């Protein structure tokens, strides 16, 4: 999930790793000890917030989604350029 409430909880980690709730702190502590993730969570109730990570193998749905979000960003920057520059060039030049 690249966007749409990146914030998560330990229930998916413990459910996918069939581990108890007492070992998830050592699990994320080892995850931060390896150095592949820099995630620091300011949570009060148990939550899992993550940061920069590298796939390093492949992702085709992220290639197509990369084209979708990339084209969306490009047409939004183009829309703002034509919008601001449209009347801005006519009134200021």
């Amino acid at each position: 999930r690249p966007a749409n409430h990146r914030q998560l909880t330990f229930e998916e980690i413990a459910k996918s790793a069939k581990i108890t709730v007492n070992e998830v702190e050592l699990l994320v502590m080892k995850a931060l000890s390896v150095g592949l993730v820099k995630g620091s969570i300011d949570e009060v109730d148990k939550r899992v917030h993550m940061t920069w990570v590298q796939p390093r193998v492949l992702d085709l749905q992220q290639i197509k989604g990369m084209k979708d979000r990339l084209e969306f960003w490009c047409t939004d920057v183009k829309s703002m350029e034509m919008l601001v520059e449209h009347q801005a060039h006519d009134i200021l030049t």
């Binding site: 960003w73 939004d76 703002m80 601001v84």
Partner: protein, 229 residues
Amino acid sequence: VSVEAVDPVFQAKMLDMLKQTGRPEMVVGWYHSHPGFGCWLSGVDINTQQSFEALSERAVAVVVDPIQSVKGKVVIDAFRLINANMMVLGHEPRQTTSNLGHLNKPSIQALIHGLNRHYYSITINYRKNELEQKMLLNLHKKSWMEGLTLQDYSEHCKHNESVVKEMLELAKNYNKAVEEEDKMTPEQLAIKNVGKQDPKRHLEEHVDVLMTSNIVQCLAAMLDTVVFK
């Protein structure tokens, strides 16, 4: 600068190496620099000019002197040699006397007419094609622009909150530092109203302060675009 310093085998060697390349142009003149004592030509320079003008009838001579010349103007002048037998007739029977007004820009009161006898000059014009205009123009605009042109924008957009705040507080310190006198101005303006004695205008400086203050307004929309998309 002397005729003995000009090596004919070195000159002809480099000219031949230019002939084997895409430079099929013959020599048209020789130039040098005269620092300090002025751009005028001594006896040795006019003697090697007299010796070097036997082949080319024109013999263009240019003297560059950027040592004492300010960086505001790079005005350069080309020199010429007059015939010694023309002293009986008119000095320079040159038509199209319009450009002499443009040749009157070097109007030093010692060198031009201080040594104008047997030593005159010629006008200089420039030329620029579209390749130099767009390549050098876009090259200079890029020389004042960034690499991707989007790098150093957010630097100032976010420095408005860290560094420019000090320049805004100091700017208000100069504003109040003038307003403390502008409190006393309505007394004189309420007494005399005739004539102006203070060379300070107190208006255009504050206009410039407003121009420096409008950077926050102009870059606020930039932060709105960076935050938006």
